[PDB]
Amino acid sequence: LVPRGSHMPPRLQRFPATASDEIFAAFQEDGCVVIEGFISPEQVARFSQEVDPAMEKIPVEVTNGNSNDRTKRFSKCVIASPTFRNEIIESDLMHELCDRVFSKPGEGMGYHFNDNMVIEVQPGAPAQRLHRDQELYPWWNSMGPAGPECLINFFCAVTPFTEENGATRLVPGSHLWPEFTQINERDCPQFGKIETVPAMQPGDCYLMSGKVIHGAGHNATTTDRRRALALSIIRRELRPMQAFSLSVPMKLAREMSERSQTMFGFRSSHFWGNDGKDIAHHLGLIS
Amino acid sequence: LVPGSHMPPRLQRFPATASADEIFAAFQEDGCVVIEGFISPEQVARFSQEVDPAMEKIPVEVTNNNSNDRTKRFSKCVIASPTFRNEIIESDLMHELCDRVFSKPGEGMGYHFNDNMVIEVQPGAPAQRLHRDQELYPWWNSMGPAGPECLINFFCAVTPFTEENGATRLVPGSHLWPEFTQINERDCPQFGKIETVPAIMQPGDCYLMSGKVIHGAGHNATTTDRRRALALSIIRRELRPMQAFSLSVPMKLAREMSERSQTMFGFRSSVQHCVDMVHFWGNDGKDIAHHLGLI
Numbered sequence: 001l002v003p004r005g006s007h008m009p010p011r012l013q014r015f016p017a018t019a020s021d022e023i024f025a026a027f028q029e030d031g032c033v034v035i036e037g038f039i040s041p042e043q044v045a046r047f048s049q050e051v052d053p054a055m056e057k058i059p060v061e062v063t064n065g066n067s068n069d070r071t072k073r074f075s076k077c078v079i080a081s082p083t084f085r086n087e088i089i090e091s092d093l094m095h096e097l098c099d100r101v102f103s104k105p106g107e108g109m110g111y112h113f114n115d116n117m118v119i120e121v122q123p124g125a126p127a128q129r130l131h132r133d134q135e136l137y138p139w140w141n142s143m144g145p146a147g148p149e150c151l152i153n154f155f156c157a158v159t160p161f162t163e164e165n166g167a168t169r170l171v172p173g174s175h176l177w178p179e180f181t182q183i184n185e186r187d188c189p190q191f192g193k194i195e196t197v198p199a200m201q202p203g204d205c206y207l208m209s210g211k212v213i214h215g216a217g218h219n220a221t222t223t224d225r226r227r228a229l230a231l232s233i234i235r236r237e238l239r240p241m242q243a244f245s246l247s248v249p250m251k252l253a254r255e256m257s258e259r260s261q262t263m264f265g266f267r268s269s270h271f272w273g274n275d276g277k278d279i280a281h282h283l284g285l286i287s
Numbered sequence: 288l289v290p291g292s293h294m295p296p297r298l299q300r301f302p303a304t305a306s307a308d309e310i311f312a313a314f315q316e317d318g319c320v321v322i323e324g325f326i327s328p329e330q331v332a333r334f335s336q337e338v339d340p341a342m343e344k345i346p347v348e349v350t351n352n353n354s355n356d357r358t359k360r361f362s363k364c365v366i367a368s369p370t371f372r373n374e375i376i377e378s379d380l381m382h383e384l385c386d387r388v389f390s391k392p393g394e395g396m397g398y399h400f401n402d403n404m405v406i407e408v409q410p411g412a413p414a415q416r417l418h419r420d421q422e423l424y425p426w427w428n429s430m431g432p433a434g435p436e437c438l439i440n441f442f443c444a445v446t447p448f449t450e451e452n453g454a455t456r457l458v459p460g461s462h463l464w465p466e467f468t469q470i471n472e473r474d475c476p477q478f479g480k481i482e483t484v485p486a487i488m489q490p491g492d493c494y495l496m497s498g499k500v501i502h503g504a505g506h507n508a509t510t511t512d513r514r515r516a517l518a519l520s521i522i523r524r525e526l527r528p529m530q531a532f533s534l535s536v537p538m539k540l541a542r543e544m545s546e547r548s549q550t551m552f553g554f555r556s557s558v559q560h561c562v563d564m565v566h567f568w569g570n571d572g573k574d575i576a577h578h579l580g581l582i
């Protein structure tokens with residue numbers, strides 16, 4: 001795999017979207033894993049064109065070290081794209097995976113959606129700061145690698161992921177380090193020695209844990225809009241960064257299955273209920 | 288007080304006109320503090336009157352178990368009570384203390400509502416298991432006493448709280464024990480040896496309590512006394528509420544709310560800073576209040 005004698009780089013396993021528990025142990029051991037072909041070939045295609053009109057009406061910032069410097073972001077994927085709401089979010093591998101990360105026996109679905117983002121790294125965009133996704137829930141790093149999982153991300157490539165256009169540089173095994181710190185020169189002892197691994201073709205995805213260090217690289221090209229679809233998924237006890245049950249129209253919620261209504265907060269798991277009853281009753285969604 | 292009689296733990300008491308700093312320091316020392324006249328007796332009585340039809344229509348569950356039985360719980364306080372939504376949730380002392388607990392520099396409101404629950408302990412109802420309210424967020428005990436706060440409770444007396452009718456039993460300074468476990472025989476070594484103290488209160492008194500404080504409803508030993516409480520459960524912005532208030536509370540009521548009341552119920556977002564900024568509970572980069580028409 002490496003020339004004999006070489007420094008071996010951090011292991012980044014890769015499974016086919018038809019694999020089994022097998023993908024999960026790669027997640028447990030490394031903190032991430034690639035699912036090659038996560039979304040079908042025409043599915044990803046129909047999806048990208050469907051959000052191209054919305055992506056077109058996002059002006060680009062040319063700035064300050066923020067994650068908005070020449071990186072454009074858009075989250076109304078259920079509204080804008082029939083392919084997303086009808087096909088992509090009903091992956092049984094997605095759910096069979098989430099149930100192994102999040103759900104406890106007897107309690108139903110321990111998870112729901114945090115965000116559905118399309119991230120498009122514009123050419124010349126500086127490399128994104130290194131971070132753990134779970135910094136979104138600021139106390140979580142304090143629990144170290146023994147803490148439970150709060151967040152996972154099915155990070156899917158829309159346009160191809162190269163080392164040129166700044167695909168995500170992962171750091172496998174970052175979830176097993178003994179202290180979880182901010183990744184900067186004052187707080188991180190290993191800053192500048194952190195060994196990355198860049199991450200894929202359209203429809204491939206990687207299933208990253210919230211504990212894993214990562215970040216978008218510099219998009220060094222002149223023409224490449226590098227586009228992605230992040231399926232952020234949190235445990236049921238945590239609050240979504242998107243208010244999906246207030247912006248997704250009721251017309252679309254009626255077309256979703258019970259699992260997908262639970263993912264978007266149109267149905268309870270009790271958490272997110274309505275005075276001892278499922279919020280789905282009051283909304284006109286049960287029997 | 289008592290006669291070399293053994294003296295129980297101290298539960299500090301303040302009037303609602305004390306300084307939120309004096310109250311907060313007490314809360315920090317003991318993890319719980321009584322605020323007398325948190326709500327005026329005229330406010331508490333109108334509230335009790337406005338929820339009472341809903342309370343009477345709630346059947347009492349009697350069971351053959353320790354099942355947390357014979358306790359009515361009602362959460363649609365905003366819909367049923369003009370006093371609650373117009374006055375009680377507008378307590379400036381409530382928001383002063385919440386900020387000192389939850390709100391970060393340069394982010395605005397770090398908290399929102401988990402629940403608004405009328406809890407009426409029926410005559411004869413058995414005592415509740417000792418618990419910490421942050422057990423609702425099961426990973427929280429594992430951070431121990433150094434952990435951040437996830438939840439505080441403004442537990443108000445609607446009818447008098449007495450030692451006989453089931454006033455809550457609290458364990459002051461249990462937010463400072465070095466290991467947070469569930470309170471059971473397997474996991475808790477002080478099990479059965481834990482000294483509680485009732486929250487004796489008159490109508491309109493609150494106690495403010497951290498999610499780190501061991502406590503439990505007491506046994507209601509009376510035959511006539513339906514012991515009514517109002518629990519204002521308040522969590523940090525990154526945590527999920529028990530109630531989906533933005534989906535059951537009507538928009539007509541949303542539009543009459545102050546901006547900070549809208550934030551409490553999820554009709555409006557809160558800006559969190561990480562280099563980056565993110566409207567938590569937002570709409571693709573903007574406040575959810577825009578798509579809702581709340582300006």
Ligand SMILES: C=C1[C@@]2(C)CC3=C(C)[C@]4(C=CC(=O)OC4(C)C)CC[C@]3(C)[C@]1(C(=O)OC)C(=O)[C@@](C)(O)C2=O
Nearest residue numbers: 270355401402404418420422423438440518520521529
């Ligand atoms: C299921 C329960 C949970 C898990 C959560 C809880 C919540 C949210 C409460 C506790 C925390 C809080 O701050 O708010 C209130 C007051 C409303 C009380 C009521 C319930 C819903 C609960 C219950 O109903 O048991 C039948 C319960 O009594 C208790 C204590 O055992 C629980 O820890």
Ligand SMILES: C=C1[C@@]2(C)CC3=C(C)[C@]4(C=CC(=O)OC4(C)C)CC[C@]3(C)[C@]1(C(=O)OC)C(=O)[C@@](C)(O)C2=O
Nearest residue numbers: 067068115117131133136153230232241561563564565
């Ligand atoms: C404000 C940001 C936060 C705080 C959260 C975040 C979310 C939720 C994301 C990250 C984690 C996740 O699990 O999902 C996604 C992919 C959607 C990415 C986009 C943003 C909104 C964020 C950002 O865009 O900054 C304006 C950002 O890039 C990052 C990484 O710096 C952040 O940690």
Ligand SMILES: O=C(O)CCC(=O)C(=O)O
Nearest residue numbers: 119166167168215216217
């Ligand atoms: O866009 C990328 O390459 C990674 C972005 C990411 O993971 C984030 O925004 O948190």
Ligand SMILES: O=C(O)CCC(=O)C(=O)O
Nearest residue numbers: 406454455503504505516
């Ligand atoms: O009603 C009480 O006195 C305590 C209730 C309580 O602690 C709870 O329900 O979580």
Ligand SMILES: [Fe+3]
Nearest residue numbers: 132133214215
């Ligand atoms: Fe990230």
Ligand SMILES: [Fe+3]
Nearest residue numbers: 418419420502
């Ligand atoms: Fe409690």
